[PDB]
Design a protein around this ligand. Sequence first.
Ligand SMILES: CCC[C@@H]1NC[C@@H](O)[C@H](O)[C@H]1C(=O)O
Ligand SMILES: CCC[C@@H]1NC[C@@H](O)[C@H](O)[C@H]1C(=O)O
Lengths: 600, 600
Amino acid sequence: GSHMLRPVETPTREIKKLDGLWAFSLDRENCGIDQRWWESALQESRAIAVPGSFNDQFADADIRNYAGNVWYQREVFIPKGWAGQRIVLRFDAVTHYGKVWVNNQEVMEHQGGYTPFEADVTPYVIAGKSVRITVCVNNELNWQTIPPGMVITDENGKKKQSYFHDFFNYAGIHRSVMLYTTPNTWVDDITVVTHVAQDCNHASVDWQVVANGDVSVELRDADQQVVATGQGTSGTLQVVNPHLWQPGEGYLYELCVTAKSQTECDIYPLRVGIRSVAVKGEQFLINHKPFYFTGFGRHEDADLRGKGFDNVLMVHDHALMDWIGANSYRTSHYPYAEEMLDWADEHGIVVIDETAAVGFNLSLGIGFENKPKELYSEEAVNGETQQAHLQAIKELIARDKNHPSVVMWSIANEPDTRPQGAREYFAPLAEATRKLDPTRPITCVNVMFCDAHTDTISDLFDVLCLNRYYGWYVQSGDLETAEKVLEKELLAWQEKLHQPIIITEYGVDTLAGLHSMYTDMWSEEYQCAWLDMYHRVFDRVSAVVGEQVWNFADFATSQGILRVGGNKKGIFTRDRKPKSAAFLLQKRWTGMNFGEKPQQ
Amino acid sequence: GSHMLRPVETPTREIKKLDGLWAFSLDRENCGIDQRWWESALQESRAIAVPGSFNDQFADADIRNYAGNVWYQREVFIPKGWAGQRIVLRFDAVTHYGKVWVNNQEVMEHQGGYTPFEADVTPYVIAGKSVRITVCVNNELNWQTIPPGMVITDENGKKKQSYFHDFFNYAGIHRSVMLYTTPNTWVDDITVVTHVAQDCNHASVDWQVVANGDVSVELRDADQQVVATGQGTSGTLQVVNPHLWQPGEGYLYELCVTAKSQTECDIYPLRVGIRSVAVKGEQFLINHKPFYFTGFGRHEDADLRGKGFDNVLMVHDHALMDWIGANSYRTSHYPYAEEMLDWADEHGIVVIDETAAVGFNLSLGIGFENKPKELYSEEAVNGETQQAHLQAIKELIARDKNHPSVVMWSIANEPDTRPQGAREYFAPLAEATRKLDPTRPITCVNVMFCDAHTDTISDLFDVLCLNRYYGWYVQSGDLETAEKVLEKELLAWQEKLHQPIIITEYGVDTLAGLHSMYTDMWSEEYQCAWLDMYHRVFDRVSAVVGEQVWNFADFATSQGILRVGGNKKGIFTRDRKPKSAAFLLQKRWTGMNFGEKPQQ
Ligand SMILES: CCC[C@@H]1NC[C@@H](O)[C@H](O)[C@H]1C(=O)O
Ligand SMILES: CCC[C@@H]1NC[C@@H](O)[C@H](O)[C@H]1C(=O)O
């Protein structure tokens, strides 16, 4: 993807613009573009908080289920001590589609809902005066979006969005908005890659695009003592005798790249961890040692902000995952806030990084009521779709490439691989991803009903990721049949592919408070029994190297007869209170040795 | 007390009269006695179920909180094949006060709310025709009732009942109503007492009042094979080599007493278990072996019947107590339905039998609002009161004397022994109880605030029963101070009295579903932590021989700022669903060896 690094603070800086309170108005009949609302202060507005989804801030179902365009707006005074500097305006996430006006000049456009976008806007502002930022946000999904969907227009012209993923289609500006200043010598991009041999010593090859001038680099210590130095726009190899990034700890050196121009200097510190991931046979190695993933599929979801990033929420949810014994998690169903990958970096949390490609499946929704008949087809998942997907992988890898916590990419989640053309679609995406980053493995999370004798595309990926729900959606309520089905299906996957197997979803809906002596579905007792049987089967299969229970907390979804106020598969309630199973896992995950598979 | 045995089925029988549907009407202005409503069919009635409390059958607060007289009524056809037989009409429990008319002849009167009452009514009916039963039920409590209370009349003359016990003052006909026929030779009463030496052999002395004729007895086997025979109105000793009644099993011989008159025979089978209870030093022996009580303080309380006896409820609640590992319980705060003591008899459940003497304490209610200033005084707990109490002990012992499950009598629960005259009151009651039955020990359950340096009456009883709530009502939320206070108070009791100590109440209010990471009051996590600390302290004190957590299920109480829909101290919800702590106890109570104290 296009060059981009996280704005970090050096002797050149940034001014936060998530002042929260912006002017918001929905655009019910698309009068916005016609009257180019970007030209004058928004007519009939109400205060909105940024970052946060717009759906639940007003406790009104008619905004919540709204489909179309919405408008955010805010004036800003640009500090004047920035004259003779390049001013860039970065949105870290505007969910689905966004385009923005610096009063009357349009600067940016973007269709990715969970990855940042910026543009050099130094020629459209001059320091000292205040300019109006106007943003147009679209929350519509068609077949060429990631994720896909179908907007449908009723007799009256009202839009209603249909999609094929579980979680609710929150929208708005979900993450940081930000003006930042950099010297006129550009450090546009950095790439770092790490190698190790027997933990004693090795090196970090390096590449850098620095648009405007000479580059020297110094890798410094936690003590910020210089441990090696390089020179050059690329190469930039140095060798060490380091303390290398390990799951329990997360030791981070600091790559200080300097960009000397003939008059201007530019300094960027990029945190690096010396880790080497690979897979060998049925083992997922990290610094040449097998690893056992424990933890969760998560979500960006809280009670009144939707998917809006929040620092308290990050701190408290890491406190819970740490207590519970989790050592890993995967950014379930879209790229997460980079704050979380920095956190995982500093604390040694291992992360499976996933794109927003969910809902490439029309076999999962179940009920009594027009979806296309060919998944892979011109009307549905098409060629435009494949390039949109490849673009989504491009942005995610472009943004999380140097993070030590990122240990694996996941292209998509639960696609249907039964129809022909599934492999036609996914093969070039797997190959392209492999060339965009050869450092980490490639996975594609596998859906329950593309079983081992049925799935078409798992050949193309390095590590097998399974979402299994025997005993819940099938064999409902019967632990003795679910155990057999699960164990032969696991052994089957192993015989078929001899890969490491990570169970990336396994869970059951559990109403907090619903208790039962009969250990039936929806009780806390059932959650415990079910997870516990699954754990015996994992412990009895050689190739399973990971367990991430399906959902850390309950989250919101679309309305339906299967979702009681949302998906209740969480170990914790949406307000982070523990169900009984929370103590089951805490007993397992801190009982085992760190990163080691329980020996049965 | 007056002679009475359970109606059991021989070649002379009984016809059940809990036909449920009776005519019920409340008597709002005491017009009942004046118009002697007993004379004609009840004016303006509604159907009521018998047995069951009248409070919650109609989902109406104005009947629920009603104080005064209520009227039940029902016609009955007396079977004619009963001519020349004695017909007796027995109410097994009419709660608080009851008096009854066989159409126009009044036959019975009773003030005990949980013990049966009958009367020979052979001269007031003749077999073949149908007579109307009319019952007047009073639910008022004054200072000479067991339990006591204060009715208070507002400006308008409406009664409202005030009391000083936790549970709600349910009323009505709570248990079996019953017409039964016996031959004109009376077996009015039987008493059986058991002795053992070294489990090899001994005897059961015996006494019998059989009003009308010669008596022979045969003690028969579970096989009903004759193992010994006696002759005489008393003495009736025989010696055995028996399999003796043990907690885990409950072996019951059958004492078949026959009453030969010159023309009529009468046969009564009375189930007996060969058990010997006593206390020695700090040990509670049963068949000369120390015992550890586990289990609950219970209640007669369910969701729509109030305190009405129900067979399903008995079967299901015994299934839960059996699963959970309980081996004992105590009939908390009133005599229970004899069905439950028969059950405990057959299954080997050990029972601490208690009278209805609760609320002899004006220091327990807490709030912001006229109770007497002297507990023991002429206006309050008086001499009439003491004779009423002695009468209550008389009836309970008279009815549960031959039950092997009954292992101890408890005169009262949580009286205040601080004021002078507490010992003046309770001493003659303790001595009288000891002469009414020397077979089993005597206890008086001790309230939290009459601590070891304060209590006045514990000298007078055999086994010390403690209700302790450190960490809940005092030291609220602090497990580390509650542990110290509890441990020194337990050791203090032991130094002071060198008796066996049974913790007969210990528990915390727990909202099912309320979970917390901070282990604070009202969460399930707090229930578990609290009970668990209490268990460490029990395990570290020599003299503690028993643990009965406070309440098996949540139950209803009077309204107040301290009771959220009732007392929430149950391990189970009112509809019998388990809280998290239910599995804590199940792990302890079935982990230990049966009847043995955990060795720490
Ligand atoms: C069989 C499909 C299961 C499905 N897997 C994807 C998750 O995004 C959903 O939350 C989960 C669920 O339905 O609970
Ligand atoms: C400190 C008195 C505690 C009291 N003990 C008697 C029981 O009948 C109550 O239910 C119990 C409670 O308050 O929970």
